[PDB]
Amino acid sequence: IFEEAASFRSYQSKLGRDGRASAATATLTTKIRIFVPATNSPELRWELTLFALDVIRSPSAAESMKVGAAFTLISMYSERPGALIRSLLNDPDIEAVIIDVGSMVNGIPVMERRGDKAQEEMEGLMRILKTARDSSKGKTPFVDSRAYGLRITDMSTLVSAVITIEAQIWILIAKAVTAPDTAEESETRRWAKYVQQKRVNPFFALTQQWLTEMRNLLSQSLSVRKFMVEILIEVKKGGSAKGRAVEIISDIGNYVEETGMAGFFATIRFGLETRYPALALNEFQSDLNTIKSLMLLYREIGPRAPYMVLLEESIQTKFAPGGYPLLWSFAMGVATTIDRSMGALNINRGYLEPMYFRLGQKS
Amino acid sequence: IFEEAASFRSYQSKLGRDGRASAATATLTTKIRIFVPATNSPELRWELTLFALDVIRSPSAAESMKVGAAFTLISMYSERPGALIRSLLNDPDIEAVIIDVGSMVNGIPVMERRGDKAQEEMEGLMRILKTARDSSKGKTPFVDSRAYGLRITDMSTLVSAVITIEAQIWILIAKAVTAPDTAEESETRRWAKYVQQKRVNPFFALTQQWLTEMRNLLSQSLSVRKFMVEILIEVKKGGSAKGRAVEIISDIGNYVEETGMAGFFATIRFGLETRYPALALNEFQSDLNTIKSLMLLYREIGPRAPYMVLLEESIQTKFAPGGYPLLWSFAMGVATTIDRSMGALNINRGYLEPMYFRLGQKSARHSSDQVAELA
Amino acid sequence: IFEEAASFRSYQSKLGRDGRASAATATLTTKIRIFVPATNSPELRWELTLFALDVIRSPSAAESMKVGAAFTLISMYSERPGALIRSLLNDPDIEAVIIDVGSMVNGIPVMKAQEEMEGLMRILKTARDSSKGKTPFVDSRAYGLRITDMSTLVSAVITIEAQIWILIAKAVTAPDTAEESETRRWAKYVQQKRVNPFFALTQQWLTEMRNLLSQSLSVRKFMVEILIEVKKGGSAKGRAVEIISDIGNYVEETGMAGFFATIRFGLETRYPALALNEFQSDLNTIKSLMLLYREIGPRAPYMVLLEESIQTKFAPGGYPLLWSFAMGVATTIDRSMGALNINRGYLEPMYFRLGQKS
Amino acid sequence: IFEEAASFRSYQSKLGRDGRASAATATLTTKIRIFVPATNSPELRWELTLFALDVIRSPSAAESMKVGAAFTLISMYSERPGALIRSLLNDPDIEAVIIDVGSMVNGIPVMERRGDKAQEEMEGLMRILKTARDSSKGKTPFVDSRAYGLRITDMSTLVSAVITIEAQIWILIAKAVTAPDTAEESETRRWAKYVQQKRVNPFFALTQQWLTEMRNLLSQSLSVRKFMVEILIEVKKGGSAKGRAVEIISDIGNYVEETGMAGFFATIRFGLETRYPALALNEFQSDLNTIKSLMLLYREIGPRAPYMVLLEESIQTKFAPGGYPLLWSFAMGVATTIDRSMGALNINRGYLEPMYFRLGQKSARHHA
Known about the structure:
This is part of a larger assembly, with 4 copies of chain A.
Chain A: H1 2-14, E1 30-37, H2 42-57, H3 63-73, H4 81-88, E2 94-101, H5 118-135, H6 146-149, H7 155-176, H8 184-196, H9 208-220, H10 222-236, H11 244-256, H12 262-272, H13 285-301, H14 315-318, H15 325-338, H16 354-362
Parallel strand pairs in A: 1-2
């Protein structure tokens, strides 16, 4: 009777989720160039990291090149650069061309053996590198200048450095897509942890100017975020121990999970799990039916769940906080009142109902 | 006994839903010209987008041309624009001729397909473009004028721009066929989101004058809305990753769902799911039986459900609130009282029953129980 | 008793048939440029055909360009030329780049690119000059025609395509001595009014293309893939696809000669000599071969054109006693046969005469 | 043992026949205009027939116009002529525009009911009609001149005439696409029959000049023959009443069926069914196995089978009597010796097997 209505609300929510979309809907494919470490030496890896930091620092490079640069920079993890990109990269809008450099002595960009027209390309790269240096007033990748010159020769120093720069990329993802400004407090807080735990090698500390330029590249590119989240999911999965490189990623992951699903988690933790007298209120009953439908929905969306926000996944919109407002306003009233850490989260949405929020605090 | 009556109400509701309609009912098919992206080159694609924005802006162009232009504009997504139209488009009133754009570097309009029998077509296009410029007092499609001039040279810039224009199509659908005036508030609110989220590239912002001209094209053409809703359903289906382009469509979808079925959902959410003790009042029985028949009916209508009103779908009339007056009026009286966001809905309809709604209000605002008393 | 031996022969034949090969074996993937159809204008379609004919006519074009030319030539049929190539092309050595030329009517070449157009110009000039002005068609008026309408277009396209497909029949079994057969097939299509004679293509061009087919495997792989694909299927085929399918009936079984000759002659002939003790090993061979043939499956009628390694096993040299007798019968009884050279080292004179004598 | 080989030959013959072809195989579709009789008014219908006869008779009209004309001419059967064409026409190479005529009130040409996008449409038509008259030196479609002028107003006369013209098209089909030279003897013989038997009204007889122009159109166009064979299959089926119209078609059918599958039939009729003692000879075995595979194959080809040759169908190559040369050479040797009517078919193919030719003759003629 009434049970049919509740079942029907659930039916509506899951209706048309099924099926496979007709192939013609495939969006116009963008060609992106990734220059990638050709061979297994710390010599190449250090120099190429310097190159890549500067490509991203350059004012003169176009966005299509800048994304590809960023992909070079955060593929330094892999034992076999080309294989790492090709095997994890799984986002349809972008079609990758991989260039494996022959120990590039060219300068900031690669060496080119394609011919006479590529001589202009190398000079475009030169202009890009010059403009990078000049526009940044001489600030190189690292905060402390010795690091900019370093040219390391051996594996142990290489991994120490690379893991340091990469951890500086991964500290960004935590706020890149969920608050791209105001980011510094959180990213420094995560930095403190990794240094205090002796995981990351502070001689290679990366400069605020470079970190902000990378943060901005993450915010403004979907294609980049897709690759990042692909790797982030892939290394999260078991069937193997992770040593230093993947371990730093996984560590950062504990901050990165659930990010930009704040509302959903908060209603579950505060209010729901807490079983306040307010659970009793009849008026908030429907809200309960809402949350039930949501939880079953969440289950059905499956593998991407902890990173929906970062993936811009549409089904994410449905999952949004003010989709279930009455319960949320009361869950916030409880959360802000009971937990000292909460309430520093900005909850200024039009979805908030003052009466219900006050009931949550009053409770 | 009483059970027979309830079963009979259900029988009436589903009677004649069955069967396949005789072909004689097919309405006279309208021939519509769609110019569509010929090749995968950003030079052609940027210019053709500018052409299409201007076709829709043109004061002298026929509705037949304008619909076809709108179809060009919202097929920019595809790797093969012709294939996208042909494969998704499934609406009987319109028969499409796809003129695959032949580079069309010939000027403002398309290039003449094989050498025109009458070059007046290119000159018809010229008139259309002139009239567009002149009538709009020189306002070009994009809001900041450099963008209107800018020839696009790479795929990167192309996708940035195309995503931007397409998003501007899809922000319209939300109100085009449900509230075709008063639209501004909502469409701006949705614009703010996509920009703030950095999903679509504000350098390519399109002018309020162009957006109102496209909003009006949506309002006044059924054939357009049919194609929009066909695509909106098709891309909603899973079994695929979506990157930025399809993701903007899909994202808009989550606002666009249930639109123009407001009253039906509102009785479900407020009143029914709310299950206030007052729901047990004897008068409501017939209304409850009504809602039950409606919910089972909704199920039966199936895949088109998320967009019934926008699709002008016939069944929609039956679904309309006013089909359950007592329950609806009670549903509103509660809703308006309990939810701060509601009540901004326009409830000036005859199907509203004042006395009963005052009962809805009166119900809504009326083992401790102390907490409820305090709040 | 006997049973172990028979089962062992079968074991050997099926041993190592199974499994899937490790990806490291994959040979370095070769980039080929396939300039493809632009759209539904006869103006573009005619000009692109002339471009492609001239690419193949050019003395200066490289192999990589020539393969891509051949792919343009045998895609001209389709409603969407680029889609036809991309969707049927299923080939482990080659990666296609396909760019449908828009304003292909800009000059001789299809429409930094300024260099490319001049590369094309050089190609076309050198083609004209080196050929001493001899046009692709047997009647030169065809080279100048500049066709404007669909009817003439399809008449012409069908005609050129049929002229490619005439070649395939002999390209990879005997690329010289081909003339007699390819003319015999041509006579049919013309007499039946299936191909429109104004567009007949010149011996000079046909020889140059026959040689290109013989010497390039990767092109022939694509051709035979399409030739198989359009041969099957419960669909209507237009004059265009119909001519391909028709040619198919000459193309099938070609370069599987031996396997067929022993089946047709000797085996199906069932000469009294088949009872003789000596045959047993050969019979056991053929059994293994028949079951093997089944296992090779969908591409079977064109193993030869595919250079398929399995082909070796099916070769008639495998069952030499029966084969020598198979020629001896065939050459004696069936007037047109036995003109195919059975002078191999495997010929056993006693058995060849026994075949004659039977 | 030996049974494996025979089964393998059969396997090869059926292998890869199955499955569904990828859409990329679709050939570039040609847009073809069919002007079609708008209503059941005899005034329009007579004039439209005259128009269509002249379209086909014109020396200056292009192939695209000529095929569309031929489609008008051989759709005149229908109560709803446009529906008949659109609903039976099922061949991928051609995409039809059907134009229903506005009572043909314009003049010599069909008159555009809703008005032309270009006013020259009417004139290009005028040029076509003029050139038709002028190039043919004034010869109207009919042999006997009163018929050329007739301008019919009544249903009875209309159907008498239409049936007569249609029958004269369908007489042609039988030979137009198997041997369009040598044709006249046969097609006159069939004409005489229908007239003598009072199935068609000889006052309306169509001239050798019109018939040759149509015969040539049939020879040279596949797309026309596709529509013709579609109709020829459709009206061959039972389960319907027929009027004079469908009856004439069906009558023609009895000449048209099996045509251009000559060899397949000839080996079945003569030699195989003939079962001469010589059938026991060891040499024949391969040929017999061939024919077995052919019979099973013929079954599998199915509904199009009575018209394979006319359809140019791929499968037909395998059926080509050249395929089974020993049996065929013997089958001709018997046939030519035993049936006085046979042997008038020209059988000068290099595929003739001397032993069987001498042996077939020697079986049938001098062996009892």
